[PDB]
């Protein structure tokens, strides 16, 4: 497997658990600090970075009834300039780039309580594909699928309905829509994080999925596996391989990386364009940093930028 070793840059340090980076409507950078802990006890935080200097603004702290969040992925929405975040411990969030912010869902359409969410991806319709690795949200005690299949799939759809598409995963991690070339939702893209597997569907509609298949392999002997991801724009999916020093690049049919990325650092979790360049933003949990470098070619557009 071929392997290029672009220049990577810095861009800002001292960031807990560095993770969800994403871009704005105004090309405003922000990234999340889920490890954040305040007198013992989670206290994660959603930054804003100042990309010329790296200097840190803390947008959000979220908290509900006195107990803190664990923000760990994020997307931009299209019709405002507002930022969904799943949060381990609160579920989904909207927050605001005031700083204002409100937990979207704590039950499911079934009634159960929600599961701790860590990755999400809007499709072109804007429904968002959300993935669940932890236990029940607060105040349920904290848990994670690193050992045991109990990691969740939601579909939050534009009717606000939280759907539960899926269940039984080993710590899902990383989630990507993959689209027709004439726009309209195809596959959705779910890392399994500890079975080294990624996994497809094909999307018929809002929150369903279905022929789930092995879609491809993550390499490597460490502990971890596939984080973050996210598709370029000949819809080649790029995925942090934690633990692995490597971001893979899988063709639009997955089986094996066709290439890797190396990194000088350990542990990348996310990774995220930014928008109409070639430019990819990585969170890393070696250094609890985050770097830039430049890839092949422009990144897919976004749901914001539709
Ligand atoms: O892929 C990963 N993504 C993230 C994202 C946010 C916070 C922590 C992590 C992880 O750090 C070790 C446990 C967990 C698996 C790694």
């Not at 960031?15 to 802990?37: H, L, M, Q, R, S």
């Not at 092995?214 to 596996?225: L, R």
Request: charge should be negative.
């Amino acid at each position: 497997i071929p392997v290029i070793e672009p220049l990577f840059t810095k861009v800002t340090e001292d960031i807990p658990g560095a993770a969800g980076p994403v871009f704005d409507k105004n090309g405003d950078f922000y990234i999340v600090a889920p490890y954040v802990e305040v007198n013992g006890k989670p206290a994660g935080e959603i930054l804003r970075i100042d990309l010329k200097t790296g200097k840190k603004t803390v947008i959000c702290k979220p908290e509900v009834n006195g107990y803190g969040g664990i923000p760990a992925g994020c997307q931009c929405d299209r019709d405002a300039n507002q930022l969904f975040v799943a949060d381990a411990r609160l579920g989904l969030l909207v927050v605001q780039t005031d700083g204002t912010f409100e937990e979207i869902a704590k039950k499911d359409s079934e009634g159960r309580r929600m599961q701790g969410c860590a990755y999400c991806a809007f499709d072109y319709e804007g429904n968002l594909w959300i993935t669940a690795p932890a236990g029940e949200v607060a105040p349920a005690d904290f848990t994670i699928s690193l050992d045991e299949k109990f990691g969740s799939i939601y579909c939050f759809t534009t009717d606000g309905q939280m759907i539960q598409v899926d269940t039984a995963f080993q710590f899902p991690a990383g989630i990507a829509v993959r689209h027709m070339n004439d726009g309209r939702p195809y596959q959705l893209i779910v890392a399994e994080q500890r079975t080294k597997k990624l996994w497809s569907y094909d999307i018929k509609g809002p929150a369903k999925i279905e022929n789930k298949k092995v879609w491809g392999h993550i390499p490597g002997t460490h502990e971890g596996g596939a984080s973050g991801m996210d598709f370029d724009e000949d819809n080649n999916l790029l995925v942090a391989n934690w633990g692995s020093s490597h971001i893979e690049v899988f063709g639009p049919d997955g089986g094996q990386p066709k290439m890797r990325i190396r990194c000088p650092f350990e542990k990348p979790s996310a990774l995220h364009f930014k928008p109409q360049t070639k430019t990819i933003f990585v969170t890393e949990h070696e250094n609890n940093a985050v770097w830039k470098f430049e890839w092949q070619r422009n990144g897919k557009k976004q749901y914001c930028e539709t």
